[PDB]
């Protein structure tokens, strides 16, 4: 209860005890007052953070490599159109449907794990692979086939440290992807281009000069 909070002076809400990774007591809208809704929101936070970490990596590492003359990857916002003009390009609707079908199969299993944490581990499910879906008792942290290197499964507090690192990195990358979307919506340049322009003149190059954030009607 004495952990650092999102406001030194504001006590944590009674539904945020401190057990969850990354619980800084931040819930001013009280969205997680229901415990089952809180568990669903924790799983949603894990999924959004992991997908944002993957997406932000796939944005900022190829863009940086293009900046230093490696691989030469186009802008992330126009990378869909760059591939869609290829001579052997899969059509957009067909590719989306294939991705959605595979993700349907995978994430309905993940959903059933969210309900009962030991769902998919029952015998006779797969073809001998059901043993890898035992889970660790907390949904969103499967283990088994996932986590091959077995990082953190040694001292329990080692896994809690890695859980906090994961949740902070996921939140940072979610904020970063929101920044990427808003930066490209306002300025037709990449995230590294926006960063380089800001270092040229921080008082001149920012969100108050794109003309899209602050509306021109007010000023």
């Amino acid at each position: 209860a004495t952990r650092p909070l999102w406001q030194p002076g504001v006590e944590a809400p009674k539904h945020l005890d401190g057990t969850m990774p990354g619980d800084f007591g931040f819930d001013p809208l009280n969205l997680g007052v229901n415990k089952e809704a809180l568990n669903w929101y924790r799983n949603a936070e894990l999924q959004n953070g992991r997908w944002a970490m993957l997406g932000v990596a796939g944005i900022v590492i190829p863009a940086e490599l293009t900046r230093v003359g490696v691989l030469n990857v186009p802008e992330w916002a126009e990378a869909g159109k760059v591939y869609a003009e290829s001579e052997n390009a899969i059509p957009f609707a067909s590719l989306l449907m294939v991705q959605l079908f595979l993700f349907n199969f995978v994430e309905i299993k993940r959903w059933e794990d969210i309900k009962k944490p030991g769902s998919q581990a029952e015998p006779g499910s797969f073809l001998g692979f059901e043993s890898g879906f035992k889970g660790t008792g907390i949904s969103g942290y499967p283990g088994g086939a996932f986590n091959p290197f077995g990082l953190g499964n040694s001292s329990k507090e080692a896994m809690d440290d890695l859980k906090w690192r994961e949740i902070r990195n996921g939140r940072l990358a979610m904020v970063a992807f929101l920044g990427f979307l808003s930066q490209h919506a306002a300025t037709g340049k990449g995230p590294l281009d926006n960063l380089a322009d800001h270092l040229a003149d921080p008082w001149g190059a920012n969100f108050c000069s794109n003309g899209v954030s602050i509306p021109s009607a007010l000023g």
């Binding site: 490696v70 015998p123 001998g128 692979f129 043993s131 890898g132 091959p148």
Partner: protein, 192 residues
Amino acid sequence: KAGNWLPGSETPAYLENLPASYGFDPLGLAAEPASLARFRESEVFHGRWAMLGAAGVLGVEVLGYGNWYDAPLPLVQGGQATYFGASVPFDLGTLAAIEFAAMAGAESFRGAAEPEKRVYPGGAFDPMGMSKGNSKELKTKEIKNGRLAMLACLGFAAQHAATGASPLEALASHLANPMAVNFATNGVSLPL
């Protein structure tokens, strides 16, 4: 056991009396006894078919009859397949139908037996009767040769996905110029 996969490690308890066991299961896929029981037969079956496939590709390339990739290429384009110069007037539909019927019959009449009988049978499959008289090290040899054959077959697939040449042609080119003709030199394996 003979081996431990890593030189120094904790060993899974369910991988000791198994032939050709090195304790290699970091994912823990065979923690359940039924999972191990099915996966053992799966590994034996995969190794046997991989040995058959590796023998097929090596014998189709070194005997000078063609490439393994180009085997079903003349199956369309009009028709007429090739096997030792035989005309074989079978089209694509009848060939697939006969193969499906044969495989369905063989596999249905196969995997309806006992767990030991599904993977390790006798009768007409060992006519010379040398399964008797120390079968553990022979099983170990079978599993190890099967693993080597699976590695060879997946290497053939990945190599033809990469450079796109023949297996023995790529081997000859690698022996001729080991500097610029490796897996690393083409722009598909090492991007940096």
